[PDB]
DNA sequence: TACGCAACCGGTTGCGT
DNA sequence: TACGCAACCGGTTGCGT
């Protein structure tokens, strides 16, 4: 079809070519007649055709694991954005947590060519962390490891600990001793991270969590609703929960409405994450909040710059949780006697 | 690359190629041998190169709106499901109302030449609509119109209007005479058309909704939390409301307890999606569901023939709303009257 | 000066033998 | 029998003049 151009405005294609990408001098007159044949024509030049002879797609793929959650389908939105801004076409990708998909995903990735790649995988088992080497070669950061668990890729780490630490505080410092908490799976970052940082907190304060006391999440409502439930179902019961994100947050609001408690009145609540809504929620939840958007054109930046600047060594960038106070927490018993 | 394979392999290029896509005999020691090689130099094929020579890239564009929100975060996480399962490769573009940033996203996609589109554009001025004509060549599947606006897409139809009278209708039949809505966007078909069908519904029953009763919602939260405000702001209040989505939905419960106000002892409240934390809102939204899924499939579906069984006849389904009842609706003063 | 030639990127596939 | 030749898809870009 750029032969079509050329023959219409009697140029070469090599000129065709140039004058539509500026990148070498065209007499006006030539300029406006490609331009002009470029019109009628309808043309649209192909990228694919572009990529074969430039080597290079212009489009980056985020291999994820499930994009409506809150929590990610902020992360993704976020990305979208920088790849747009900076001329970028974005491959949503989610596997899942599911190795097959996710070999899949990755493979037809390496094969469309995507110029580098985002990962986040959630949990990363050994054959995951052997399949991302098999494709070190294509650029990549991982968004969502705690530590960095390979030299073969950028990351991006939150901090997921020291946020949880601060949750553990807050209830401490406002009169809690008596608390409880429904982490995330421990597979994950956010899961064991956020739950270590939030026991280190109490032992410092000599405070125990009875086992009857932890329940395990998986990041859904429906576990929020159910660990919540388990929690106030028995004889003793805290006067405080820690629960390991926003959504499983809002699912122990629930349930604690369904058994007649009283938030924070009856129980005090802190969550996690700072999702978009969680000041709605009712009530408007005091949480921990994550930074979701840093988290993204962090790691957008990070991959341009091993793109562009071709950068060889892995680089790994830190961003902060930070408290936000709602109304979910109430005083604890302990509170006038510090 | 496919050249140093063959070298190894001591075979054509042409043989390699038709092993890899079997779509030839080759004498399995040959197959073998090219196996091999492949495996050695670790080698991708490139999609491009394939595309630029068979014409299609299998991969396929949505051009959406936003894609954090639980709606269309819905919508969207289904879509890909379908693409993965019939080897697409999805291409998420927002351009968030904005003709620019969507004549700026509906060019790169051509350009990268995807497969067919699927558009979710909520708004549709005529400029827009000028615009999508002027790539009727690449076939596409409209997802958010109410009825079909252009002879050269196919669309999909959701009934928005029966499943706004659906809402007016229970409101009515549980004993509600005062009753206030909060619609969407007129200038969207969840809007204007959620919001005329439970117009219809009222007329039929002689209910006049008081003009300082009806408040524009944006589908975000803080609309739901500002109308909702506004509306018991009042001296004379409804004792229901019809909320044109969930999300504000989930605004209007906030506010509502935060006056102090029950729910639904003190209003009763009807949503509109079925999201899926709906149910945890609090109290349990009883909300008409909107099959987000088969929403997704669906234009899935009728955007693959169009491709592979090269349909040039525009097509048009219809899917259908339905309530669902959870708790924040009450009986009215009207129930025992009827 | 302002522009064109022809090889190249990496695969597919119709004819042959 | 089982496989290879060479043109083609649609652009880019080093040398020239
Ligand atoms: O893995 C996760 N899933 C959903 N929400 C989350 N918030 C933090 N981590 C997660
Ligand atoms: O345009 C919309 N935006 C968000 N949620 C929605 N639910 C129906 N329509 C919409």
Redesign the interface.
């Known amino acids: 079809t750029i032969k079509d151009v050329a023959k219409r405005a009697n140029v070469s294609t090599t000129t065709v070519s140039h004058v539509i990408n500026k990148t070498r001098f065209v007499a006006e007159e030539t300029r406006n007649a490609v331009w002009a044949a470029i019109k009628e024509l309808?043309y649209?030049?192909?990228?694919?055709?572009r990529?074969?002879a430039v080597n290079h797609?212009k489009?980056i793929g985020l291999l994820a694991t499930?994009?409506?959650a809150?929590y990610f389908?902020?992360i993704?939105?976020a990305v979208?954005?920088n790849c747009?801004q900076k001329?970028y076409?974005?491959?949503?990708?989610?596997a899942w947590n599911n190795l097959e998909?996710q070999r899949?995903?990755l493979?037809?990735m390496?094969?469309?060519?995507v110029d580098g790649l985002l990962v986040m995988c959630s949990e990363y088992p050994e054959p995951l962390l052997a399949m991302l080497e098999?494709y070190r070669h294509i650029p990549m950061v991982v968004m969502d490891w705690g530590e960095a668990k390979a030299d073969f890729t950028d990351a991006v780490i939150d901090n997921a600990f020291e946020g949880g630490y601060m949750a553990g505080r807050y209830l401490i410092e406002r009169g809690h001793r008596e608390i409880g908490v429904i982490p995330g799976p421990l597979e994950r970052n956010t899961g064991a991270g956020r739950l270590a940082g939030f026991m280190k907190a109490m032992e410092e304060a000599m405070i125990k969590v009875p086992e009857s006391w932890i329940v395990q999440g998986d990041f859904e409502?429906e576990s929020?609703?159910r660990a919540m439930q388990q929690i106030l179902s028995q004889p003793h019961r805290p006067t405080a929960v820690f629960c390991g994100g926003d959504?499983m947050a809002?699912?122990a609001?629930?349930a604690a409405?369904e058994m007649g408690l009283r938030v924070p009145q009856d129980v005090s609540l802190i969550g996690y994450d700072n999702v978009?809504?969680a000041?709605?929620?009712?009530?408007?939840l005091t949480t921990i909040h994550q930074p979701k958007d840093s988290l993204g054109e962090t790691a957008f930046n990070m991959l341009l710059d091993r793109i562009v600047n071709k950068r060889e060594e892995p680089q790994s960038i830190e961003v902060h949780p930070r408290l936000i106070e709602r109304r979910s927490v109430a005083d604890g018993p302990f509170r006038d006697y510090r």
Chains 1, 2 share one sequence.
Request: hydrophobic residues 35%; neutral net charge; contains cysteine.
């Open positions: 309808h649209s030049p192909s990228a694919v055709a990529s074969l797609t489009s499930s994009s409506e809150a389908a902020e993704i939105e979208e954005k747009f001329g076409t974005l491959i949503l990708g989610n998909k899949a995903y493979s037809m390496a094969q469309k060519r098999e409502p929020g609703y959504i809002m699912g609001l629930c409405d978009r809504n000041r709605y929620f009712t009530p408007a």
